[PDB]
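Dock fe (iii) ion; give full complex structure.
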Amino acid sequence: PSQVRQNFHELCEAGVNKQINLELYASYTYHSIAFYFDRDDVALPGAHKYFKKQSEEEREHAEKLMKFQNQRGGRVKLKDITAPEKEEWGSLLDAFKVALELEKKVNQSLLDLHGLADSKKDAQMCAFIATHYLTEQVEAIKEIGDHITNLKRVGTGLGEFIYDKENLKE
Amino acid sequence: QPSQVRQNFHELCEAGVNKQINLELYASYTYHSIAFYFDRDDVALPGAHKYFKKQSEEEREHAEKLMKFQNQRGGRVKLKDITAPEKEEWGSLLDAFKVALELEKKVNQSLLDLHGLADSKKDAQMCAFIATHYLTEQVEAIKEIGDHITNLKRVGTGLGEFIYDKENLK
Amino acid sequence: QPSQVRQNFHELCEAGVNKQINLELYASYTYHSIAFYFDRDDVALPGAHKYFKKQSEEEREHAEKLMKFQNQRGGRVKLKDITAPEKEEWGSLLDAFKVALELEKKVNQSLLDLHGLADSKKDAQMCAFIATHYLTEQVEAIKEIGDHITNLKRVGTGLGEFIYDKENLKE
Amino acid sequence: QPSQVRQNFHELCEAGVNKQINLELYASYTYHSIAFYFDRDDVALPGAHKYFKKQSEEEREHAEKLMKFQNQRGGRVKLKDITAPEKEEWGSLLDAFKVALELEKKVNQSLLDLHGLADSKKDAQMCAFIATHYLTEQVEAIKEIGDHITNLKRVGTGLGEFIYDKENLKE
Amino acid sequence: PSQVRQNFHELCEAGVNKQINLELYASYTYHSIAFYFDRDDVALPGAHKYFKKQSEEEREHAEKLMKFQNQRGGRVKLKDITAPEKEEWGSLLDAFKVALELEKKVNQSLLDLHGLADSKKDAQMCAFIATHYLTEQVEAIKEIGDHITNLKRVGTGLGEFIYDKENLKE
Amino acid sequence: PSQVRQNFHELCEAGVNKQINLELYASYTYHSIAFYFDRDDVALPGAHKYFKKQSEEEREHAEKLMKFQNQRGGRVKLKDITAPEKEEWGSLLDAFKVALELEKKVNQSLLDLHGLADSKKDAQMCAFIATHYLTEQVEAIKEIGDHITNLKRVGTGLGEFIYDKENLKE
Ligand SMILES: [Fe+3]
Ligand SMILES: [Fe+3]
Ligand SMILES: [Fe+3]
Ligand SMILES: [Fe+3]
Ligand SMILES: [Fe+3]
Ligand SMILES: [Fe+3]
Ligand SMILES: [Fe+3]
Ligand SMILES: [Fe+3]
Ligand SMILES: [Fe+3]
Ligand SMILES: [Fe+3]
Ligand SMILES: [Fe+3]
Ligand SMILES: [Fe+3]
Ligand SMILES: [Fe+3]
Ligand SMILES: [Fe+3]
Ligand SMILES: [Fe+3]
Ligand SMILES: [Fe+3]
Ligand SMILES: [Fe+3]
Ligand SMILES: [Fe+3]
């Protein structure tokens, strides 16, 4: 075993590797969404900028887990990053509904990971997940919630143009 | 018809937050009373006046942060009457701090109960929120009030109350 | 019996001030409720959340100024239960501002009554305090809310609500 | 019909760009793996960790510029799975830069093929794009990796690896 | 019972007092190691500086636990500080292996203390330990793992001089 | 024998090692006194700060002697640090009387060490001790004498609060 490994269970190591893959998957999906809004027949630059940023942040989420794996003396194990569900994402509202479903799936994954760590009495790993993931996920779901509400409010056409400029770009 | 953001948030936890919101508001109202008691012409302790107004304001912030939490998790804020404080007149500086210590310990037990409920429903995010934002401020507040009581017993009545008020509360 | 500072301050006027203090806190709590309703994920109007949060804080300040006045005059603050707000849910931006107009007019009438009472007891300093600090703020608040209602009717539902919230309430 | 912006852009060139995007992402993921390998407690080379993290990031930028180019020309981005890196463990600093040279040359050949395809369809825009942003960075990248390999052979294993990591990669 | 004491078990109070002694014992060991590297026949100034700093940090760890004891209304009980295991600590690599051993020993003590807190539903004591101690320890252990790896890599003689200058002095 | 050793007797080397232990024992006593004044039922923050600072200075005194040991080519030999004489230290005036006792005890130890140096014609060790230790000790003793006198003058209760604020906190 690694010289630094202490109170770190093989199932927890495995759970971190699974979460790294899911974070990379979310990153790639937002990347797809970002460049969909950059198409000449879509042309919502606020969404393009917003989802690009989201993609970057999800990559940082993966890196912090890779960093965590090494601190605890686990070994990073990488799998393929599955291509996103769709090639085209529809409206601003459609894209946000996809984002909410993705964020809730990631959140349930992190809640299962936390539960795993608690079951093995990994107090460090519980603290780490609670401090860096669980509140960002709640805040992210709430933010997407609000976007969906406002996108239904502003409607289609001019409303989308304005929401894109005022709320995603600025 | 669950909230679109709601995930791993029990109805009993929702109700527990609403109960804590009322308790925080109640504490704010009690400090407000105490603050204006020390502004009476026949009491006239400006340090205490300023101290307890600030305590009132902080308790209102504690309530707001739980209202914010309730909305983040997709629960619904339900407001009740704020009960008038226990007394119209609060006696000496020492008497007011003995009241505060009893209040803080009451609020603390309520936060420990609320944390216990969250843990019993495996609401790991709610555990972290309460630990991060409430449990250590409560411990620091109780210790601070203990030190105040100790010092108010030491300085005694009359000149000591005037000095303590100027040196430690103002 | 009376405070060493008390001069020309009738017990009915002392009682009137305690009743105004309660009304101010009641209005604070109502705006607080409204503020957190606009922060719900299924309403999500951040401009209104911010506006009503500030209104809540202001009304608490109006209560504090009265508690401070009570003590200046040597009256004694007497606090009562702060009644829960009328509604749990407040509907549209328009519905919320219509509630505010109603609330602000109720508070105004109460202050005008209190001023009446002060004058009936020839409490000139109390008349001056009420006129100086409350009667014009009240007039200005009711005008401001009237303008809000007019503009919320003009912009309509949907896009207009989003724009009004961002342009007028947030900024 | 075709995109309103599409002019002188062949479907095989579109396909080529999509294949290059996947390759750039593949390269990015490989450098990511290498980066975190050097962060292991039993490898502990902080310069190389920082260096390969930065290489991972730049490759992702290379991918983004081609997606941007795809949309500029009125083509459509088609994403495929990103294949996991070929190894879990990357050996020495020298071994890692040997993998990097192999990878950089493979990507260069794919860019030279893409350029040949552009020229074959008389896509002057695309030739110029590839030559301006890709062909020279790739030559510079290969030269840089070549110099790293030579220097890592010069310095030894052991002390030399620590010194090179701190003096050359941590910069 | 202290006026401030609430939800603080005697066994948790005892464990805090045990931890304080352990923190002070680590401090004294680091102090010894620091002054060994200052001997004219050892003369590694980077190590002297580094281990002095480690000695100072461990004393701070002890202080934070004494402060916590008082905050919770426990009473600080102090025991002899046992002299370090050796008078002489060998090579840079020998000293770092001692450090990894010590840090892993301390960490197990903190994981046990956290376990005790949890067994008594001391929610605030769990938060305290995880926030201030559990992640610091995992960072400390990883950093020492990294030192050992690099000290094996650089070898003895010239490598030790350079490591001491380039990594420990800076 | 150390390459650096010249005109340094074994008995002087032994006395330096004795002094180091005494400096560390004083440091630990001051640490105990410091954290007693931090208890919720004592709560004298000026004393807490003052005795913490004294604790830090005594550790520095120990360090300077370990440095001197190494400069002269003696070898540092460390012994257990004996727990302080009391767990509880009474009044501000009680703690200062303990301090005068401790400081006079240390000073006699330094005067004996100086005597030993002189008996071995260790001219540089006489200079070291007189320069760094003998006048500091006389200043320390006078300052504590002054505290005791002023603590008798101010009396208990209000006087202790004011002295703690006005003299020890500043
Ligand atoms: Fe994420
Ligand atoms: Fe890193
Ligand atoms: Fe996310
Ligand atoms: Fe509170
Ligand atoms: Fe808010
Ligand atoms: Fe409180
Ligand atoms: Fe008002
Ligand atoms: Fe005031
Ligand atoms: Fe108003
Ligand atoms: Fe590239
Ligand atoms: Fe772009
Ligand atoms: Fe490249
Ligand atoms: Fe420690
Ligand atoms: Fe302190
Ligand atoms: Fe440590
Ligand atoms: Fe000393
Ligand atoms: Fe030194
Ligand atoms: Fe001293």
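Observed: The radius of gyration of chain E is 18 Å.
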